[PDB]
Amino acid sequence: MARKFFVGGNWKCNGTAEEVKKIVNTLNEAQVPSQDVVEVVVSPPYVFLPLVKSTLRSDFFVAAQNCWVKKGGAFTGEVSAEMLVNLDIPWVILGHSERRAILNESSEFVGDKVAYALAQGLKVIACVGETLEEREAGSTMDVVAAQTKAIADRVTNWSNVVIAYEPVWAIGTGKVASPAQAQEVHDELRKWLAKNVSADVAATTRIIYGGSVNGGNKKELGGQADVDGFLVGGASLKPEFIDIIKAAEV
Amino acid sequence: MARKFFVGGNWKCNGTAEEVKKIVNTLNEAQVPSQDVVEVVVSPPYVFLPLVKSTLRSDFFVAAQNCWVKKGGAFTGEVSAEMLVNLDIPWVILGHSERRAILNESSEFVGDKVAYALAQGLKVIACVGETLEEREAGSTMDVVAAQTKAIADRVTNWSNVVIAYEPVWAIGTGKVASPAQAQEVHDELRKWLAKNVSADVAATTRIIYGGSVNGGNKKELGGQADVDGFLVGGASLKPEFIDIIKAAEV
Numbered sequence A, B: 001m002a003r004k005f006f007v008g009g010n011w012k013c014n015g016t017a018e019e020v021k022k023i024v025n026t027l028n029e030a031q032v033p034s035q036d037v038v039e040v041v042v043s044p045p046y047v048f049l050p051l052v053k054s055t056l057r058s059d060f061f062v063a064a065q066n067c068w069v070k071k072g073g074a075f076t077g078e079v080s081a082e083m084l085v086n087l088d089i090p091w092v093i094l095g096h097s098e099r100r101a102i103l104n105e106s107s108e109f110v111g112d113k114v115a116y117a118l119a120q121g122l123k124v125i126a127c128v129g130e131t132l133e134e135r136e137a138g139s140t141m142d143v144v145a146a147q148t149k150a151i152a153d154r155v156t157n158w159s160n161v162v163i164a165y166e167p168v169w170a171i172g173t174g175k176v177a178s179p180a181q182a183q184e185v186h187d188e189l190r191k192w193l194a195k196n197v198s199a200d201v202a203a204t205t206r207i208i209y210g211g212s213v214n215g216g217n218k219k220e221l222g223g224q225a226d227v228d229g230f231l232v233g234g235a236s237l238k239p240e241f242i243d244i245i246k247a248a249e250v
């Protein structure tokens, strides 16, 4: 069965109570393709997770932007996966490029987070991606395979995993990734999954594009053979997020 | 005037909606010394900050357990100081030993957080403390002074700062640090403020003890000349937190 298009919206470290109410209302009024056609996840900061879950339309789902690597306890400042389950938050973003780079989350740390989140019943958007230095060194697939392998070695089930490829080398560097460049990485990543995990896992796992997506490139990006949707950054705070969801209609 | 006793309760990475309701109800029914005698702050995980703020007695105050180093934006998983202000959360804990050690927060990173939080109008519990290895090397005051200096170099107004000394070394040594051991560090820390900031800042800044506090030592610790209260860990989840608040009555 074909992979269901997936659109996640990462709000990052943004939001006020008034802004969140506006974003949620605009999402609630949106008219988008059916749940059979597209799966929509929105990810507010921790402090807004109960508010968004309590007010968002029930056919869009809520994600935390991170969670802790293991059971709760003496980890001041962290939020455990079981906390998210207690609050009926079904999804979590793990390994986002900003946490790998600015907060120095290693691939093994991320992989341990994915496994623990899955073991608590969460669904995971697992992020991978190479930097500009890594791409110019010709290490793109070496880096992305190593990041993916660290996850693969630690999980027991891929059913509730979505992989997000982030072309970090293009974000904020001035460079711009083409739909062909994105398809190139996605194809190779899915090929890695078929070889190293299983053909079934490669065929069924959504691999979403985490680079710059707008009205101009959304159709061409979403139509790529191995691109199954988007992990949206800043546009997820804006009405145009709805336009990006509408790319699922083909 | 004498420094007002200060009792902070750090819930760390603990709590369910059900357990939070029980904790808050027990706090709300507590009968403790007057607000002139003791200042009480409780610190839930991010996802419970709105819930606790909306239900807790107005004479106890709410703290976040961490916040981001600067303005919000592209920092997936982080919570900015201006978010805390937007949610009417007045306090934040910064530099907790678990974040310095496990999450590798540097003294300069902590210092920049303290300054940014103060600039946004938050009050700050700034945490310092040496490891077992550092204490056994003879570097207790070298370490505590260096951590404090990184904050002092970035802070111009200390009015809304409380310093918490955490004897991190006492977890490894399995030792109940004696009241004399707390007093000697607190005294040297206050003397450091007098010489490196000002006599007035030394005289007015609360320095609270972040080691293990129980019925056998709460009076003895609180009665020390340079100990102005407690930063409680796991006991803050339990009714015994109220007995620690009651140590302010002398």
Ligand code: NA
Binding pocket: A221, A222, A223, A224, A225, A226, A227, A228, A229
């Ligand atoms: Na596609």
Ligand code: NA
Binding pocket: B221, B222, B223, B224, B225, B226, B227, B228, B229
């Ligand atoms: Na005292």
